[PDB]
Design a protein around this ligand. Structure first.
Ligand SMILES: [Zn+2]
Ligand SMILES: [Zn+2]
Lengths: 56, 118, 92, 98, 156, 143, 231, 56, 56
RNA sequence: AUCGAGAGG
DNA sequence: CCTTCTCTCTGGTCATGAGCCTCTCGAT
DNA sequence: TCATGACCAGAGAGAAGG
């Protein structure tokens, strides 16, 4: 129903905003290079995790 | 580093030591040319490089429609007409920092905040 | 008359294609919740526009109804099976 | 795909002649340190020289192709940040209208 | 971890640093070669303090390495450890000094010394030999860690 | 009104015009027409000339090529036009003939037959490229 | 056009990733052992090292690529003129120089030209290939993608028929010439050759002349599927 | 895709389908989904022969 | 018994051994594959019983 | 019989 | 030092293989 | 087609001599 689709699309929009925030944070070299992986790897993992969270 | 050649043969010069005066000379092995060194640096080897990250910046950059236009202003001329791209360097451990080029004054600036060089 | 142009794979690496001519309309809500979600173009330096995105399909897949609502392996399977359906192959 | 067509093959000689008559400096007269910001020019994967101010050349070539004075199935690619201009009249390249 | 020594990420990090392989190449930024014949004074205005703090108690070719702060801090490494490792490598066949952890730049200055004729005069080896020495320093210098363990992660 | 921008519906018009001029197998037909009109002659004029030296010199060279319309030679019969339906029924090969202009020069000849080339249907040498829908029906070919 | 035979030029960076001796050698068609690039350049009439590097590094303020090229010049230092470069050749005196001269215009970059007196174009193109190689080795440009469609060509009916017809016409010509040799004291054109070869290829789908392996391309010609119109 | 500007690490640019099968996929989403499903088809094609050799 | 030269016997042996080999095994390192009529490789006793379609 | 192509689960 | 031998890991070419079963047609 | 053990001469470590 309408309410549920509204909540779904708002969830997807908030996930998109989360990914945008992480991307801009990475663009300013403000990423913590945690041990054992590059910055790009951390960024990719964060974005993939966010999108899977949103889908589920 | 720089590189110099013999004026007569146009072949590369090799370092030699003027032992008695402790001088640095660049000699040729084609002819008997020898010149005075203008820099003590003889060999540089970068393992981490910032060269080529802004490669391929030509004045016609504004006519590449595949490149994205941002909304930032130029620190020099304050023109919001600018393009940007990520580091052209293709090493796997490369910062995801944006380089902007102004379409009004050809000035290259950066989204980086942890440092600001060149 | 310079209205349509042939583009190969190497050339389109230097262009920015639009999906619909509506992407050339100026932007300035009450959207149908049933319509699919189309993101804004967020690109303006267009050089070409697709004739119709449905032209990315072949002969077989062009028979499928609503292939945009199907898991893609099912579309592959249907493209494989349509070549085995019975019918009038030629009038003569 | 439906609108997918395939290149048939064209003669490159008129293209090269038109190049050499519109500022495409030949390769033996290419002074790299005296013309550093020069765009290389390829015709079917063969380097035929360099060219300066290639935006005008690219506009002229696209105007000719969109007119018919060049075979529409010829591909003309200006890579800017690489300073290259590659022209293919090869046979067997897959294209589509736009 | 050692039985009972679990639930202590301090010793966990210590073991991780002790086991993860670390080469000299992983911390170097650039490796330069200069002709710097005067030991008491360098042509480089930056290394002055380095030789100024060197007054306690060869070859004019200088091999100068710059190190990355991020690579030194992601690990637990001080310039003294790197210097002691490079000195342990060649066993007095070259002179080595370095900067301190407080300076804006992390530098290591090395010179060659031949025992036969460099103890009485300043004879210079072929600069082609310092290239091979730099190759051995960047490829065959084991700072710490173990042979093939090129990465270590702490998990709970 | 004349210069107003198009909509997504009008695109279909263009698509229609695309096929009314190309059909669906334009690739095959264009490749084969290019092969017959141009490539064949180039292959013929490539190192064609032959030289034999005795004490004189005899030279044999090939000139322009000619590609007939598809015909067929019946044994105990004569050459006559071959249409596709007859080829598919009689297990024939819808091939036309090749004739080269050969000339013999000496030191200090008419058209010659070299073989038959199979013809792609609806190419510039196929009888159906110029055929009307009614002509197709009379030739027992599906439009 | 003509004999579309393939010559595979390989410019190999023999230096390992972290090792020294970053030499750059080249593979020549009829030459056993790889050849350093500077010897090939001086064989092409480009003697000075500065001119060689100008043919490779198209910018003066690019010292990384030039420093990469130093071992090549130190490798080719032993040869300093053109005839000495041509003398470095793999065979079983003066004939080796001519063999090298012939290879450098017949088998070396034949797509450029096979006419003698065009060494500048080939030298510049070799420098271009070396520049691309070093742009890759310096992690400045990414490895060339192989599955990019623009690098792919679709041989359609035209090219396949041409590949077959060139062979068939060559066989016909050889038969005609052998007949002329056989007719030294006295129209003998077996048209069955061309027709039969074309029909065999178009029927069996084996694109060749009664061969199995040399005509490894099988299934080129297939029975038209007439089950349904869309099929 | 040539319909995106260069260096676009956006969710939709790199294969996130925010629509449902019920709602319908966009052309870019369609192509990315087909690209993903082809990988599964190829894995199903190859793992069969590999597992056949293993079982034998 | 004809009194042949010393190196025509070389040819006789290079043919006899080759034929006996190809009759035993036709696919070997020697580039000659002993093609039969119509360019077909001669089926050897080895390949006769070797393989999934083989005898065993 | 061989060789090959296409197709099904 | 330097040979000289006596076994030595070290470097390289080579053989070998690649899912069952089933259907149809086509050319020699 | 192509990766990968399984091999199998040649350069190559020591010990022993010289
Ligand atoms: Zn000189
Ligand atoms: Zn500005």
């Amino acid at each position: 129903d309408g309410p549920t689709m509204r909540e779904i699309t708002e969830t997807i929009a908030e996930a998109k905003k989360k990914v945008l925030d992480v991307t801009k944070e990475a663009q300013a070299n403000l990423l913590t290079a945690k041990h054992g992986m590059t910055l790009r790897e951390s960024f990719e993992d964060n974005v993939v995790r966010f999108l899977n969270e949103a889908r589920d | 580093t720089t590189f110099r050649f013999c004026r007569d043969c146009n072949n590369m010069l090799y370092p030699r030591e003027d032992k008695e005066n402790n001088r640095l000379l660049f000699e040729c092995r084609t002819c008997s040319y020898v010149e005075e060194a203008g820099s003590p640096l003889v060999y540089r080897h970068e393992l981490i490089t910032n060269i080529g990250e802004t490669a391929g910046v030509v004045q016609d950059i504004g006519s590449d429609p595949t490149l994205p236009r941002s909304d930032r202003e130029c620190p020099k001329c304050h023109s919001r007409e600018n393009v940007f791209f990520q580091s052209q360097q293709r090493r796997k451990d490369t910062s995801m920092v944006l380089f902007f080029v102004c379409l009004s004054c050809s000035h290259i600036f950066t989204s980086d905040q942890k440092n600001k060089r060149t | 008359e310079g209205l349509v142009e042939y583009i190969d794979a190497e050339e389109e690496e230097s262009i920015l294609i639009a999906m619909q001519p509506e992407d050339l309309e100026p932007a300035e809500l009450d959207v149908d919740p049933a319509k699919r979600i189309r993101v804004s173009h967020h690109a303006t330096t267009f050089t070409h526009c697709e004739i119709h995105p449905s032209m990315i399909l072949g002969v077989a897949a062009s028979i499928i109804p609503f292939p945009d609502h199907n898991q893609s392996p099912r579309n592959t399977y249907q493209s494989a099976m349509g070549k085995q359906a019975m019918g009038v192959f030629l009038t003569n | 795909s439906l609108m997918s067509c395939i290149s048939v093959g064209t003669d490159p000689m008129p293209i090269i002649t038109f190049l050499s008559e519109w500022g495409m400096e030949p390769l033996e007269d290419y002074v790299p340190h005296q013309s550093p910001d020069a765009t290389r020019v390829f015709v079917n994967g063969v380097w035929h020289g360099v060219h300066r101010n290639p935006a005008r050349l690219m506009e002229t070539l696209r105007t000719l192709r969109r007119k018919g004075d060049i075979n529409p199935e010829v591909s003309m690619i200006r890579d800017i940040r690489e300073k290259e201009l590659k022209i293919f009249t090869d046979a067997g390249r897959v294209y589509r209208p736009l | 971890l050692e039985p009972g020594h679990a639930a202590d990420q301090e010793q966990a990090k210590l073991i991780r640093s002790a086991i993860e392989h670390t080469t000299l190449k992983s911390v170097t930024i650039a490796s330069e070669i200069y002709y710097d014949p005067d030991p008491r004074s360098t042509v480089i205005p930056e290394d002055e303090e380095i030789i100024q703090l060197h007054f306690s108690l060869q070859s004019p070719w200088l091999l100068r390495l710059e190190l990355d702060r991020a690579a030194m801090n992601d690990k637990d490494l001080t310039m003294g450890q790197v210097g002691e490792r490079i000195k342990q490598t060649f066993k007095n066949d070259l002179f080595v000094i370095w900067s301190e952890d407080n300076d804006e730049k992390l530098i290591i200055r090395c010179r060659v010394v031949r025992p036969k004729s460099l103890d009485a005069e300043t004879e210079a080896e072929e600069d082609h030999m310092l290239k091979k020495i730099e190759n051995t320093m960047l490829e065959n210098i084991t700072l710490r860690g173990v042979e093939n363990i090129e990465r270590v992660v702490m998990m709970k | 009104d004349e210069s107003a921008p198009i909509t997504a519906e009008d695109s279909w018009a263009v698509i229609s015009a695309f096929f009314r001029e190309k059909g669906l197998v334009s690739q095959q037909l264009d490749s084969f027409n290019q092969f017959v009109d141009y490539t064949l002659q180039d292959i013929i004029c490539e190192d064609s000339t032959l030289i034999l030296e005795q004490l004189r010199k005899y030279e044999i060279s090939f000139g322009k090529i000619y590609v007939t319309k598809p015909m067929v030679n019946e044994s105990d019969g004569v050459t006559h036009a071959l249409y596709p339906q007859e080829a598919r029924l009689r297990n024939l090969t819808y091939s036309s003939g090749l004739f080269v202009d050969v000339k013999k020069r000496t030191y200090e000849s008419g058209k010659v037959f070299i073989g038959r080339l199979p013809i792609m249907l609806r190419s510039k040498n196929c009888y159906l490229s110029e055929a009307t829908e009614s002509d197709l029906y009379k030739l027992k070919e599906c439009p | 056009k003509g004999s579309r035979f393939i010559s595979t030029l390989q410019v190999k960076l023999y230096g390992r990733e972290g090792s020294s001796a970053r030499t750059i050698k080249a593979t020549l068609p009829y030459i056993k052992q790889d050849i350093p690039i500077v010897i090939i350049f001086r064989a092409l009439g480009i003697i000075p090292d500065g001119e060689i590097l100008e043919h490779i590094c198209y910018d003066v303020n690019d010292w990384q690529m030039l420093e990469m090229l130093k071992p090549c010049v130190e490798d080719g230092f032993v040869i300093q003129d053109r005839e000495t470069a041509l003398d470095f050749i793999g065979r079983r005196k003066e004939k080796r120089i001519q063999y090298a001269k012939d290879i450098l215009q017949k088998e070396f970059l034949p797509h450029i030209t096979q006419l003698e007196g065009f060494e500048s174009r080939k030298a510049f193109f070799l420098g271009y290939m070396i520049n691309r190689l070093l742009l890759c080795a310096l992690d400045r440009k990414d490895q060339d993608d192989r599955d990019h469609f623009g690098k792919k060509r679709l041989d359609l009916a035209g090219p396949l028929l041409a590949q077959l017809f060139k062979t068939l016409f060559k066989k016909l010509t050889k038969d005609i010439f052998r007949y002329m040799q056989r007719t030294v004291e006295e129209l003998a054109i077996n048209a069955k050759t061309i027709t039969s070869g074309l029909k065999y290829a178009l029927a069996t789908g084996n694109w060749g002349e009664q061969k199995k392996a040399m005509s490894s391309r099988a299934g080129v010609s297939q029975v038209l599927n007439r089950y349904t119109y869309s099929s | 895709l040539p319909h995106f500007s260069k260096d676009d690490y956006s969710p939709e640019s790199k294969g996130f389908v925010e629509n449902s099968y019920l709602r319908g996929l966009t052309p870019q989403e369609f192509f990315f989904h087909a690209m993903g499903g082809r990988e599964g088809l190829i894995d199903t094609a190859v793992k069969t022969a590999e597992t056949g050799y293993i079982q034998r | 018994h004809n009194g042949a030269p010393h190196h025509a016997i070389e040819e006789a042996e290079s043919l006899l051994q080759f034929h006996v080999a190809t009759y035993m095994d036709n696919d070997i390192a020697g580039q000659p594959q002993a093609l039969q009529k119509s360019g077909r490789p001669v089926k050897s006793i080895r390949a006769r019983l070797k393989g999934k379609e083989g005898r065993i």
